[PDB]
Design a protein around this ligand. Structure first.
Ligand SMILES: CCCCCCCCCCCCCCCCCC(=O)OC[C@H](COP(=O)([O-])OCC(O)COP(=O)([O-])OC[C@@H](COC(=O)CCCCCCCCCCCCCCCCC)OC(=O)CCCCCCCCCCCCCCCCC)OC(=O)CCCCCCCCCCCCCCCCC
Ligand SMILES: CCCCCCCCCCCCCCCCCC(=O)OC[C@H](COP(=O)(O)OCCN)OC(=O)CCCCCCCCCCCCCCCCC
Ligand SMILES: CCCCCCCCCCCCCCCCCC(=O)OC[C@H](COP(=O)(O)OCCN)OC(=O)CCCCCCCCCCCCCCCCC
Ligand SMILES: CCCCCCCCCCCCCCCCCC(=O)OC[C@H](COP(=O)(O)OCCN)OC(=O)CCCCCCCCCCCCCCCCC
Ligand SMILES: CCCCCCCCCCCCCCCCCC(=O)OC[C@H](COP(=O)(O)OCCN)OC(=O)CCCCCCCCCCCCCCCCC
Ligand SMILES: CCCCCCCCCCCCCC(=O)SCCNC(=O)CCNC(=O)[C@@H](O)C(C)(C)COP(=O)(O)O
Lengths: 60, 144, 81, 53, 117, 151, 288, 48, 85, 107, 134
């Protein structure tokens, strides 16, 4: 339980900075990998038909 | 000391008996205030507490008993259960009256019930005709 | 409390927020006595600024994440095109 | 206990295991399959059909 | 706002939520094909399909269950043909939308049937 | 048979579980066990409370005991029929609305007949009380028609 | 309803912040708040046909609106996360009333994972700070806790609905299946607003506790040398990263088909950006 | 009846709650090492 | 944490020298807050509240009347922090 | 009123010194027999809770409290139970319900 | 060895109103610069009324207490380690004589500590005899 007065934290170890870069790299790698490989969930899996310019001869 | 020796006596009806009753309860004569003998009153017992709580008492005073916030021979309040730190006691006084909180809550609930059950018969729906299932004998056709 | 600072290392004019609230109080015609007490916070060297903390919070390790993404692009092309 | 000391029909108070029907995908043995024990007496037998009585 | 708001405004024009067709089919008298099913009820019950997911293409879901049980728990290898099953559902959804749109036009025809007399 | 690696792993874990227990049964438990015979206990038919006299108490005990035993026998009749319906519900997991309707019909008929014989008697149900209930019920269906129609 | 703290029996969770933080994590994240949903997942057959479905669809949506507006106006970290549990429970119970028990369970498992990490974080913050947990005290923890702040970032964006996380894989499937099925207009208004409300109080908690001026007091301790907490933090961190990813592929033998228009499909992402900017830029305080 | 149910939903949620509780307890040792009777808290969490 | 009397003395004198209504000179632990310095009745509330936001505990009103110099301020802080060395 | 506060303060100081003498006693602790320091207020509270009946008189306020507190809910609850069971008994004995459509068959 | 006295002065009431008003003011305004600006504004509002006499000061004190009751925050900021906070009395320390009721085999784990305790029992009974008498 280290304590510093009227100042910020003590300078952190190599392990915490390496771990923070690991967490950020893993999260953003998963996010960017899923925006590349499966971009279909955001826009929509199928294109929505307009149901306005359909011909009356096809539908009767 | 037993229950027959230390016991609330009769209602005083005398200034001298009131002074002796105040001296009996370690209560200053101005402080003592007996219950009115209305059939449910307490004869020869002080009326103490009865604020908005025992939690209203300051915790920074050096009490002899900090778990009840009382002195040594200070007599117990008559409804000490109901006004205790468990039930119905607050540190600060409440901001509004008691009817305001219930009135605002029931007004909000009445408005939300009226708005929800007025819109119960008109529900949002996508342009979809009907879900299609193969019961025997549909003879149902496509658009091809 | 192991390393207490001196009273001369805290100056009001270093922090711009204390400068602007002192200028606003001078426009009002009043002065604040306790304004030198909050010099150790809003310090740009040990503590961060508002813009740098948000950038190191939301976008943290995004270059590492983009490098791992490019590594998976590089190794996934050899396995399945 | 759950293999050889099940709740038999002769007693009350065992751990009476009732199991559901397993699914059958294509590639399994006998894919066109109707559910067995469709007679009413076959449900909840608890070993009564193999009783010597 | 929304289509239900128009259901509060034009009940004779807008059909409403989950509508039965209320019309004799082949009104246009075109070659409407009959919707048939490859699978039967016996292997539908053998595959333990629920009552909600018994659509006109439940055999694509049956093949998806076959690919799930073929490679389990690693079920990310059937994904493309999984998408194939979803496309069949999408086609069914399109047909539902088609029927609803046809419904609106027919009620519009009923509107000029109210202008017929 | 190992279609998926998960099913092959489950078969392997089930074989590792299955092996020592059947070895301990067939090698240790099944030898050195003597072959004794136990029988399901069978009862005669004591005369019913109809033939019992008013002052007789030796035969009201036998009639009350066979009434209690018949109440018990009908209790696991209804209980077994309920477990048959529940096993129908579990075994026909997506199609219990078709297969279990006749089993539910037999269960409802059994509950109706059980309440007609034993219902509203209370905690202290003697053989006299059910017989008085049956006499009053048959009088009501003779005069006023069946119960639930009216009158 | 009384177990899962809905209208009006919802007052026992700010009471439940008086518990120690690991058991508050267990109670709110999983266990007691979750159990009421599980019994209604069992009784969904009755609820989807009765008037109890309409009553719960009103009441859990009101719990959503009350919980999100509460967590926007509260100044207590543990009470804000309790209100976040209430908002997620209201979203789950409302989905349960209109069938969709599998979608409710899918959001339940991911919510239990991410909520526990946030409670484990919040407790790590409170230990290092003097017990006091008023969010006006801690201000600048994004530098001072480079791993606890990162874990709070990941699980907070999972609660938000950042795309392709465990929260998003069930929140998007909840919010689009309601948009393709029949819904009351009041319940459709209460949904998107609550999802907007959630990124509003999540990014407000971002600006108070982190990325700002440290306001705690003259003497404080701040360190990241503890690691017995942080190993379990990494365990639930990897689980919160790939948890909805492993679960979406195996909870669904039949994937739900989405054929919404582009504006209703992007409505949840649009209200996420609107609530994220509105829950942050309003929270900025300047002079006058 | 004393009854147990083994379906996929109950088994999955039971596994998730056990994993959550194990990681919260491994958190709770470092969180509550300043406490007096940690054994009381851990056995009570186990009965919970 | 770990405290000593010299750290409390340094903290109290540091935050008192940061106060602008008092001059940094002519400040001592035995100096009275009322008549020896220029602070009025209301500035003592600001000094007591500065003690509260530094040392992390709030001080009652009668204890604020009891404290009149930095010496019993140090004694009052050392009583609750229980250093006594 | 200031002298009343001073007299109350002097009495409180005397009781505080009595409490500090008696609660922290070596010789009372050293006997090993547990107990409580002699508190008058707890004994008066206990005997007020036990021996309260001797200050109870028949008064219209006490009669109204005993009427609308205990006897009146008993009367309306017994009337509601009797009315519901009489209506259900008339329905059950007239013959308006069947043996298969009857609630609470205990089966 | 003094206890606080139950009387209150007008100076005490104005000081308590000023402290409670600044506590409510810092509970309303989170940032320190805005709190300092509003604290100087409240200082000017309390410094403008110093020149008034006793009756108008009492009336202004009552009006200020009433208005502070009107504008009081629903969650005021309080220190958790002090009274009224969440972390107040997190653990209850029993009195030390339960250490007197340990087993002798359980007392054998700290023999130097229990011998020191016996020495302080002799010192305490000497102190109690010279302080409170026999
Ligand atoms: C069904 C589901 C639950 C339904 C509801 C059940 C009832 C409600 C829940 C009751 C919970 C207890 C509340 C206690 C509150 C409190 O503050 O207590 C102060 C008290 C303070 O204790 P302490 O002085 O700090 O000592 C700390 C440890 O207790 C020191 O350890 P210890 O030596 O005292 O150990 C306790 C001992 C108590 O022993 C006994 O009761 C007798 C048995 C002795 C051994 C016999 C061997 C044969 O029990 C055991 O050793 C066995 C049980 C241990 C946990 C098992 C978890 C299994 C997996 C889950 O706290 C406790 O005692 C808490 C621990 C309780 C442990 C288990 C209690 C056993 C009974 C459980 C009954 C469950 C239903 C059957
Ligand atoms: C990739 C994605 C998927 C995976 C990730 C997501 C899911 C999992 C989530 C968690 C992820 C990992 C999180 C890791 C956190 C740290 C765990 C760990 O290894 O901690 C070290 C542990 C304790 O170390 P220490 O602090 O020294 O404790 C005292 C001695 N135990 O020390 C040890 O563990 C070492 C000693 C172990 C001794 C016991 C080993 C097992 C023995 C058999 C036990 C059988 C129990 C049977 C009874 C119960 C079951 C019926
Ligand atoms: C052992 C249990 C394994 C369960 C695997 C479930 C599964 O299929 O998970 C798929 C998921 C990756 O799927 P995803 O990346 O979304 O899509 C594939 C893109 N071609 O895979 C994952 O998210 C990783 C699952 C790891 C499970 C570890 C369990 C311990
Ligand atoms: C000591 C323990 C005392 C326990 C309570 C009493 C127990 C005995 C009750 C006997 C009365 C009773 O239950 O009668 C049942 C009878 C049923 O009614 P039924 O046969 O259907 O006739 C049609 C009525 N119109 O009901 C009737 O016939 C209705 C009777 C109506 C008249 C009731 C008069 C009550 C008078 C007040 C008594 C209670 C208050 C006493 C004073 C309290 C002062 C604080
Ligand atoms: C031991 C210490 C002293 C204890 C005191 C407290 C005793 C409590 C126990 C009370 C016992 C039961 C009293 C009677 C309850 C009601 C009984 C009942 O079944 O009443 C039904 C009767 C129906 O009324 P009716 O209109 O005639 O019926 C039409 C039906 N087609 O309805 C009626 O007859 C209603 C009219 C009578 C109601 C009496 C209420 C009395 C209340 C207290 C009065 C005190 C004296 C004043
Ligand atoms: C959010 C806003 C909340 C604001 C709450 C506070 C608002 C109240 C401001 C209204 C004005 C007041 O109430 S001033 C109260 C009375 N003040 C006085 O100074 C009374 C007159 N002065 C005196 O009696 C003085 O001589 C002493 C005796 C107070 C002298 O000062 P000491 O040196 O402190």
């Amino acid at each position: 339980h280290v304590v510093s007065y009227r100042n910020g934290p003590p300078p952190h170890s190599k392990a915490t900075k390496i771990g923070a870069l690991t967490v950020g790299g893993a999260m953003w790698w998963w996010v960017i990998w899923h925006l590349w490989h499966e971009p279909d969930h955001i826009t929509g899996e199928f294109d929505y038909p307009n149901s306005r310019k359909w011909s009356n001869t096809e539908l009767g | 000391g037993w229950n027959k020796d230390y016991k609330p006596g009769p209602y005083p009806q005398t200034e001298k008996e009131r002074l002796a009753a105040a001296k009996k309860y370690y209560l200053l004569p101005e402080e003592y205030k007996p219950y009115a003998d209305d059939g449910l009153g307490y004869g020869d017992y002080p009326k103490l507490g009865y604020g908005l709580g025992v939690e209203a008492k300051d915790s920074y005073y050096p009490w002899d008993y900090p778990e009840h916030k009382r002195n040594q021979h200070e007599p117990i309040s008559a409804d000490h259960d109901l006004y205790s730190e468990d039930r119905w006691s607050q540190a600060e006084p409440p901001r509004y009256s008691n009817a305001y909180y219930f009135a605002c809550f029931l007004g909000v609930m009445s408005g939300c019930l009226a708005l929800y059950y007025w819109l119960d018969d008109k529900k949002m729906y996508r342009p979809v005709a009907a879900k299609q299932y193969p019961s025997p004998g549909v003879k149902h056709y496509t658009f091809e | 409390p192991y390393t207490v600072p001196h009273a001369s290392t805290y100056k009001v004019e270093s922090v711009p927020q204390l400068v602007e609230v002192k200028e606003a109080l001078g426009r009002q015609g009043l002065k604040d006595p306790w304004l030198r007490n909050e010099v150790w916070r809003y310090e740009p060297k040990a503590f961060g600024t508002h813009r740098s903390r948000l950038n190191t919070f939301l976008f943290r390790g995004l270059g590492v994440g983009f490098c791992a993404f490019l590594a998976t692009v590089a190794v996934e092309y050899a396995l399945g095109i | 206990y759950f293999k050889y000391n099940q709740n038999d029909w002769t007693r009350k108070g065992g751990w009476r295991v009732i199991h559901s029907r397993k699914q059958c995908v294509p590639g399994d043995e006998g894919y066109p399959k109707v559910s067995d024990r469709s007679a009413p007496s076959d449900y909840a037998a608890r070993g009564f059909n193999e009783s010597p009585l | 706002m929304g289509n239900a708001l128009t259901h509060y405004m034009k009940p004779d024009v807008m059909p409403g939520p989950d509508v039965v067709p209320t019309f004799d089919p082949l009104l246009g008298f075109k070659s409407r094909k009959e919707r048939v099913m490859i699978a039967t009820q016996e292997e539908m019950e053998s595959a333990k399909l629920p009552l909600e997911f018994r659509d006109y293409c439940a055999h694509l879901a049956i093949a998806y269950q076959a690919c799930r049980s073929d490679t389990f728990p690693f079920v990310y290898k059937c994904a493309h043909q999984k998408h194939e099953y979803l496309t069949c559902e999408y086609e069914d959804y399109v047909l539902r939308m088609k029927e609803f749109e046809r419904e609106r036009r027919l009620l519009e025809r009923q509107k000029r049937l109210n202008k017929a007399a | 048979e190992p279609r998926s690696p998960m099913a092959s792993f489950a078969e392997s874990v089930l074989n590792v579980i299955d092996g020592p227990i059947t070895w301990f049964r067939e090698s240790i438990v099944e030898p050195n066990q003597q072959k004794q015979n136990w029988y399901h206990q069978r009862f005669r038919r004591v005369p019913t409370i109809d033939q019992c006299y008013t002052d007789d108490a030796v035969c009201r005990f036998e009639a009350d005991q066979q009434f209690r035993r018949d109440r018990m026998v009908d209790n696991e009749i209804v209980n077994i029929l309920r477990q048959r319906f529940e096993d129908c519900t579990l075994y026909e997991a997506p199609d219990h609305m078709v297969k279990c309707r006749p089993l539910m019909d037999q269960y409802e008929k059994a509950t109706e007949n059980w309440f007609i014989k034993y219902g509203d008697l209370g905690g202290y149900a003697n053989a006299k009380t059910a017989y008085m209930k049956q006499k009053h019920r048959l009088i009501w269906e003779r005069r006023h028609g069946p119960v639930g129609s009216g009158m | 309803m009384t177990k899962s703290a809905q209208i009006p029996f919802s007052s026992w969770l700010p009471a439940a912040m008086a518990a120690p933080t690991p058991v508050s994590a267990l109670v709110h994240s999983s266990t007691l708040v979750t159990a009421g949903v599980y019994l209604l997942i069992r009784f969904n057959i009755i609820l989807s046909t009765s008037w109890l479905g309409q009553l719960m669809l009103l009441l859990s949506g009101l719990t959503m609106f009350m919980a999100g507006l509460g967590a926007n106006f509260e100044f207590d970290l543990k009470k804000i996360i309790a209100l976040s549990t209430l908002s997620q429970l209201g979203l789950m119970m409302s989905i349960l009333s209109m069938g969709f028990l599998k979608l409710a369970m899918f959001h339940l498992l991911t919510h239990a994972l991410f909520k526990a990490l946030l409670f484990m974080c919040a407790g790590a913050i409170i230990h290092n700070m003097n017990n006091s947990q008023d969010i006006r005290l801690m201000g600048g923890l994004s530098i001072h806790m480079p791993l606890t702040s990162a874990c709070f970032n990941v699980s907070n964006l999972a609660l938000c609905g950042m795309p392709f996380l465990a929260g998003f894989y069930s929140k998007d499937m909840i919010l689009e299946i309601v948009s393709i099925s029949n819904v009351n207009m009041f319940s459709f208004f209460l949904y998107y607003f609550s999802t907007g409300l959630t990124v509003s109080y999540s990014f407000r908690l971002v600006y108070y506790s982190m990325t700002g001026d440290l306001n705690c007091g003259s003497l404080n301790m701040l360190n990241d040398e503890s690691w017995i907490m942080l190993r379990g933090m990494m365990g639930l961190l990897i689980m919160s990263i790939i948890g909805g990813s492993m679960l979406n592929w195996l909870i669904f033998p039949f994937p739900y088909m989405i054929c919404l228009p582009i504006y209703m499909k992007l409505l949840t992402l649009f209200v996420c950006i609107v609530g994220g900017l509105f829950g942050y830029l309003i929270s900025l305080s300047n002079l006058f | 009846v004393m009854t147990f149910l083994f379906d996929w939903m109950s088994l999955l949620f039971m596994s998730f709650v056990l994993m959550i509780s194990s990681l919260v307890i491994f958190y709770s040792k470092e969180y509550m090492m300043n406490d007096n009777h940690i054994n009381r808290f851990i056995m009570l969490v186990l009965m919970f | 944490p770990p405290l000593s009397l010299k750290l409390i003395n340094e903290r109290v004198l540091l935050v008192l020298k940061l106060y602008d209504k008092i001059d940094p000179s002519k400040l001592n632990v035995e100096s009275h807050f009322i008549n020896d310095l220029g602070l009025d009745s209301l500035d003592h509330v600001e000094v007591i509240m500065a003690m509260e936001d530094e040392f992390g505990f709030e001080i009652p009103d009668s204890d604020a009347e009891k404290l009149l110099k930095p010496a019993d301020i140090i004694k009052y802080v050392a009583d609750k922090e229980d250093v006594y060395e | 009123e200031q002298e009343f506060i001073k007299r109350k303060h002097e009495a409180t100081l005397k009781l505080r010194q009595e409490f500090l003498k008696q609660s922290s006693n070596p010789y009372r602790h050293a006997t090993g027999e547990g107990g409580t320091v002699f508190d008058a207020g707890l004994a008066r509270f206990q005997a007020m809770r036990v021996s309260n009946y001797e200050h109870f008189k028949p008064t219209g306020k006490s009669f109204r409290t005993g009427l609308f507190a205990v006897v009146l809910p008993i009367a309306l609850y017994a009337w509601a139970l009797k009315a519901e069971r009489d209506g259900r008994e008339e329905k059950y004995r007239t013959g308006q319900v069947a043996y298969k459509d009857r609630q609470f068959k205990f089966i | 060895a003094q206890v606080p006295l139950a009387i209150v002065s007008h100076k005490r009431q104005v000081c308590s109103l000023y402290k409670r008003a600044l506590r409510n003011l810092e509970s309303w305004y989170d940032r320190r610069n805005v709190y300092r600006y509003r604290a100087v504004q409240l200082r000017a509002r309390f410094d403008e009324n110093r020149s008034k006499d006793l009756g108008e000061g009492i009336r202004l004190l009552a009006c200020g207490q009433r208005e502070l009751f009107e504008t009081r925050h629903f969650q005021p900021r309080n220190f958790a380690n002090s009274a009224g906070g969440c972390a107040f009395e997190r653990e209850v320390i029993p009195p030390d004589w339960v250490l007197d009721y340990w087993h002798p085999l359980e007392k054998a784990q700290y023999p130097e500590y229990f011998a020191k305790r016996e020495q302080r029992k002799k010192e305490f009974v000497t102190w109690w005899e010279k302080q409170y008498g026999k």
